[PDB]
Assembly symmetry: C2
């Protein structure tokens, strides 16, 4: 807990220390990364992670709708361009679609969202809903967990292909290459947090908002663990079929 | 799937069939009902279920804010009176607090919401956010899962006191009695569904909405399973203390 307002520098260090809770320390992430995960588990990860990615532009658009500052909006929309693709070219979403096919899932499998677990949906939807309601500074700042991402790993040829030979190399490589080409300022979140949180009370609240964001990523992986690692998907005691809801009910009729 | 529009009485039977997916069929509920749950699992269940219970009034008020029909609102508001108490009298929320005391938790433990798991929080908040955005008819109809609740928590000595004699008898009896006195019309959502859902398209959508409501309840028990039955609470690889966010960010500063 903070009593005396931290300085921009020490506040940056309180923010970065939340990195210890990043989802890379989740066992499901670790099993995947070590080559220990099964085919079902990989495919389930890609299909559920896909839901988080197709929601990010809705979430960025929500922030912009709450942002009366044109200069901020000019930087922020690059996040939407990134995912959706612009100038008639392909974007991040197309990268994730290429990974799906590389791991053996079809375009329609991913796009339909049919394999997305309720637990994943609720966590991801919490992110969107926070961005719809919170002030734009607070919602924008929550994007700074992106600073905890790996080294953009490539000194690892012994990492995925190697570990999972059944994954098609063409697709995987298109995925890694579309993503290393992002144009969004991954730092904007931190710069904004440093400028905006200029009192003890805001700084403490921002650390809680960061915690919320981390709780979302971790909770996505809990849901995957239950379903694909522990044999306990929703309703397993009553049916062997997938029976969870499959619709973004508030945004689409059917 | 529904092909051609079902009659009201036949549509009712399709809604009732979804009770096969009610949360009483979840392993965590079964273990509690069977006498095999631990004290930590029971305490964790009361604390997390209490987050759901304190949210119901907010969700019912969100329905009312979207309902321009006075006649509906006069029935709906009794749900709020049931939960919060009226004319000085106590209400269902006080019954849950007594249940918490009865299983060994303090009122501050419950009221503070500090033990609520993020996975429970995200599922419960998805309910409130659906009610805030969906048309009032669709949001109201989801309350019909209350029809699936068994004989209002009562059986010939098979219960909780014989399996868990450490449960305090005063609190427990206050809980069972105080909940039996609710005045809300639990059928209201089912009567509105039969009147409102008068096409195949509405019927199928309503079935998906009920499924969404069922997925909430199941997903709350998944998160409790992960924390209290499988020793995998959030961040268990990095810390043994509780580090999840504990604040309803969009409704309270701290």
């Amino acid at each position: 807990l903070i009593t005396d307002t931290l300085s921009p520098q020490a506040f940056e260090e309180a923010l970065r220390a939340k990195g210890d809770f990043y989802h890379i320390h989740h066992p499901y992430h670790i099993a995947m990364h070590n080559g220990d995960a099964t085919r079902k588990q990989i495919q389930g990860w890609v299909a559920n992670r896909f839901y988080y990615q197709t929601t990010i532009p809705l979430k960025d658009a929500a922030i912009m709708a709450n942002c009366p500052d044109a200069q901020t909006r000019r930087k922020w929309v690059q996040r939407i361009l990134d995912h959706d693709g612009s100038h008639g070219e392909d974007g991040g979403i197309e990268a994730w679609l290429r990974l799906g096919e590389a791991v053996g899932l079809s375009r329609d499998d991913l796009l339909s969202e049919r394999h997305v677990l309720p637990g994943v949906r609720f966590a991801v939807d919490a992110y969107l809903n926070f961005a719809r309601r919170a002030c734009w500074q607070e919602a924008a700042c929550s994007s700074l967990t992106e600073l905890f991402a790996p080294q953009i790993h490539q000194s690892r040829l012994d990492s995925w292909p190697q570990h999972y030979p059944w994954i098609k190399e063409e697709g995987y490589f298109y995925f890694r290459s579309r993503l290393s080409q992002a144009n969004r300022d991954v730092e904007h979140g931190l710069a904004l947090a440093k400028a905006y949180c200029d009192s003890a009370e805001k700084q403490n609240r921002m650390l809680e908002i960061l915690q919320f964001k981390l709780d979302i990523l971790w909770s996505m992986l809990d849901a995957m663990t239950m379903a694909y690692a522990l044999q306990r998907p929703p309703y397993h005691t009553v049916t062997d079929k997938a029976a969870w809801h499959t619709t973004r009910l508030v945004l689409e009729h059917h």
